[PDB]
Amino acid sequence: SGIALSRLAQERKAWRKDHPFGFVAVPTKNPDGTMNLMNWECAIPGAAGTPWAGGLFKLRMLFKDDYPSSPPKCKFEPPLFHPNVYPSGTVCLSILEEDKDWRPAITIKQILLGIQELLNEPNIQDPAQAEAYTIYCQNRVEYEKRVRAQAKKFAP
Numbered sequence: 534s535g536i537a538l539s540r541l542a543q544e545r546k547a548w549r550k551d552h553p554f555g556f557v558a559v560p561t562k563n564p565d566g567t568m569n570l571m572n573w574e575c576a577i578p579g580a581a582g583t584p585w586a587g588g589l590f591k592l593r594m595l596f597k598d599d600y601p602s603s604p605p606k607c608k609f610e611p612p613l614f615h616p617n618v619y620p621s622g623t624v625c626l627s628i629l630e631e632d633k634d635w636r637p638a639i640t641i642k643q644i645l646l647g648i649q650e651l652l653n654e655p656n657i658q659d660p661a662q663a664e665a666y667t668i669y670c671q672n673r674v675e676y677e678k679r680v681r682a683q684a685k686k687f688a689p
């Protein structure tokens with residue numbers, strides 16, 4: 534897709550020029566070694582001063598041929614404990630749905646910051662995995678304990 538690839542090159546240039554510290558976002562490679570702009574490997578650092586601090590949380594960002602009409606699918610690999618992350622790893626977030634709050638102008642940087650913000654502030658209206666959601670609702674102290682253990686597990 535010429536339209537998607539042109540925009541993704543634009544995103545890559547912008548990201549490399551200016552991006553938040555500790556974040557990573559890079560396109561992958563095709564089997565022949567060439568760059569594959571439709572599939573990115575990213576990492577989001579936990580915010581300091583939060584239970585996510587010190588963790589580095591890896592995720593894949595997958596673009597459809599009609600991007601930026603459509604949002605990327607964003608999928609934590611491996612899956613994360615969080616009320617709004619499906620067991621598959623896929624992120625449940627309104628800016629990542631075409632029929633909700635996605636806008637074509639939204640940047641990869643805005644997506645990754647949006648997901649970082651989600652990590653530390655779950656949306657109770659969007660339960661995506663039963664366990665983390667139930668614990669978040671029932672016992673915030675236990676919830677944060679599980680989150681800190683997870684951050685340690687994924688320390689760089």
Ligand SMILES: Oc1ccccc1-c1ccccc1O
Pocket residue numbers: 557558574575576591592593610
């Ligand atoms: O290992 C990484 C280091 C830095 C940034 C991304 C990754 C990654 C993200 C998703 C899937 C695989 C990966 O290797």
